[PDB]
Design a binder for these strands. Sequence first.
DNA 1: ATCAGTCTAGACATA
DNA 2: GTATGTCTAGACTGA
Lengths: 124, 123
Amino acid sequence: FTSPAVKRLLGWKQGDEEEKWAEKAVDALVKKLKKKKGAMEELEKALSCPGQPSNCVTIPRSLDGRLQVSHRKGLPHVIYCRVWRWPDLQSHHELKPLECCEFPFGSKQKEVCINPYHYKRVES
Amino acid sequence: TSPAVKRLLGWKQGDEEEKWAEKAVDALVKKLKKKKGAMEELEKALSCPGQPSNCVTIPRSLDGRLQVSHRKGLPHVIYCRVWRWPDLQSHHELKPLECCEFPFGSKQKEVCINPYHYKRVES
DNA sequence: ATCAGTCTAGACATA
DNA sequence: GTATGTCTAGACTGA
Ligand SMILES: [Zn+2]
Ligand SMILES: [Zn+2]
């Protein structure tokens, strides 16, 4: 919770390189998800009701696994998990897929799931 | 041209266009080093314009364009601007010489970028 | 329609 | 076998 005066002031806050980039990455993901009925709704369900189980929300997997957004390359699940869960997330080594996930990064299928709540954070 | 002047000109700032053209030449050299005779041949053509030279080609893309540092153009146009007509407008101002066996229009695997394998025309 | 421009997966290179 | 970053043809998108 935030004070109205404060959230107004925060309205004018400058976002940094990282936050500006993350917006680009979300923009990129939405372009993909609009093309699939149920995806946008589903992802919004997952983000809004974390406690309640949700479906896989996938994008095409590249040959090397990486995704490029505005001249940065990363791994998709890592990217989106940083955005919506663990901003300080280090690498894919700090992530394990839940059993409920049908399309986890490691499975190297056509599709890769980017539902942040289909992943759990770990050590290594 | 004077030594003091060329010294002073040493410190001249190149503009976006010239800096880009340096990149485009760099890009072309990377390609030509890989082909024995190409670099020498291109140098022959540039240095002895009067004397006939061979085709110097690079791979042709599907759409014909070449990209160098986030700018797209047509290769013969690019390299003709560099070494001949800086004010060259488009491929419409260019016609290939008969001596050229890989001219832009021929839409082959290779496209010739020897600037002296082209002549400048109106539109 | 050409034409012109943006974005990135795949290739490739510097580690 | 990683990994990280760069470049650009091709795919795509608007005049
Ligand atoms: Zn999933
Ligand atoms: Zn030629």
